[PDB]
Amino acid sequence: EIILLDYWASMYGMRTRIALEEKKVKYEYREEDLSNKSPLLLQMNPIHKKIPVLIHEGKPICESIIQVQYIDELWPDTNPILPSDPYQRAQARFWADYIDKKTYVPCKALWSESGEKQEAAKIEFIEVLKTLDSELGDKYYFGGNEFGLVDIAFIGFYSWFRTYEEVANLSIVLEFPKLMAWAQRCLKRESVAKALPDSDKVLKSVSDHRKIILGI
Amino acid sequence: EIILLDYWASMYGMRTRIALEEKKVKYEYREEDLSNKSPLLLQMNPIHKKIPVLIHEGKPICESIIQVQYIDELWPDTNPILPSDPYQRAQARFWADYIDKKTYVPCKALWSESGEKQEAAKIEFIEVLKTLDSELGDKYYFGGNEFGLVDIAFIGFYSWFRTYEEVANLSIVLEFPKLMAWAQRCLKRESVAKALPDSDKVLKSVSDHRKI
Ligand SMILES: [Mg+2]
Ligand SMILES: [Mg+2]
Fold first, then answer.
1. How far, in Å, CA of A173 to CA of A132, rounded?
2. What are the CA-CA distances from residue B88 to residues A4, A93, A107, B128 (Å)?
3. Was A172 annotated as part of a binding site?
4. B103 touches chain A (CB under 8 A)
5. What's the rounded Cα separation, in Å, for the pair B79 and B13?
6. What contacts A36, CB < 8 A, 6 or more positions away?
7. Which of A45, A85, A191, B27 matches a 20 to 30 Å C-alpha distance to A171?
């Protein structure tokens, strides 16, 4: 029994959706209402009370990158996610940690705010894009020749690029062609295609939120 | 060849010192001047430009919990740090992540700030202590019956407890006897005793810093 408590537009939740599909395991997806958290969510993640929460045989695993590693360790011989070499594994973890640190808090403001908070977030996210663009270099994947941990860690953001361009006046698609080509590569995988929502859907939802909540 | 670029009072650097000693590997420790970062530190950690940096055969590994895992994966059969069970390993990673997230900012503020910022830091750190005390429960170690990753992740903070008490007017020693007993347990390991600086030394350094 595997249950995933998640929110459709969460790029962090998408990571775990992708990991599960890479391993071809059957699981139950449960959509959470962020304004009305389920008792199960509160019971399983009492410390943070956030999605995604992975429940395996009644036991919770919290934090998306920890979930992905857990899934890779349980089914290591089916579409291995992490590298086998300890140094390369450390580098994968580093870049996944980088993405989390630079985006989870300082980038929610990209769509949920206007004014100075949004402006600060724009500067931060453009720096993230430049840094990852440089890290990718001319490789097919962040994992080198094969799809890996860091690819999973960032690909969900692709479904938000059009939103960031429209609500935060960012230029992403035309400015980072290497990243766009990388995303198109990843999108061909069934796990990724299944996990990522349509970009127009994300945009409509965020626009509606901004109109209703921010009056913008 | 193993080089560790570190700062003596960094509780994050202490983690990697402890892991290295747990594996009994020989390494070169290099003390960094935080106000004058070496060219080697900037070359090896261009993204964050912070200590600790572990250099192994000329290749950098950054971030202390990633360093500890790296060390454990290179020498897994000598004093294993992480659990062998994947679920237990996920929980260890969770609590190490919790510690990093909740402390990295509000513990700098404990000693480097005053006023509302320091008061806010005090509330956050007391919450951390209560949460970890609850998680430890009646176990000998965060790792259960044996010293493990989460123990390594938090034990360096012990060397700062006196500082937090004195500069932030916190009560820790009298309020968390289970955590105090846990720290005494950890201190019996040579790796931990070697890594943790004297509590009074940390306080003097911080006091001088606050004045100047
Ligand atoms: Mg690979
Ligand atoms: Mg153990």
1. 14
2. 19, 19, 31, 21
3. no
4. no
5. 19
6. none
7. A191
What Å resolution does this PDB entry report? 1.6
Identify which of B76, B78, B81, B79 has the alpha carbon closest to the alpha carbon of residue B65: B81
Q: Obtained via which technique?
A: X-ray
Fold of the domain built from segment(s) B85-212: Glutathione S-transferase Yfyf (Class Pi); Chain A, domain 2 (1.20.1050)
Domain boundaries, chain B: 1-84, 85-212
DSSP A216: -
Q: Say yes or no: B47 contacts chain A, CB-CB below 8 A.
A: yes
**Strand pairing of B28-31 and B2-6?**
parallel
**Ligand 1 is a single-atom ion; what residues have CB below 5 A from it?**
A 143, 146, 148
CATH T-level topology, domain A1-84: Glutaredoxin (3.40.30)
- What span, in angstroms and rounded, lies between the C-alpha atoms of B65 and A90? 10
Query: With contacts defined as CB-CB under 8 Å, which chain B residues touch A97?
Result: 63, 66
Min Cα distance B104 → chain A (Å) is 12
Q: Which residue has the tokens 């005793």?
A: B193
Cis peptide before B60 (omega within 30 of 0): no
DSSP string for residues in A105-147: TTTTHHHH--HHHHHHHHHHHHHHHHHHHHHHTT-SBTTBTS-
Q: How far apart are CA A166 and CA A208, in angstroms?
A: 13
**Helix (H) / strand (E) containing B187:** none
Q: Which CATH architecture has domain A85-216?
A: Up-down Bundle (1.20)
Rounded to whole angstroms, the Cα distance separating A203 from A199 reads: 6
d(CA A23, CA A168): 36
CA-closest candidate to residue B94, choices A10, A38, A69, A19: A69
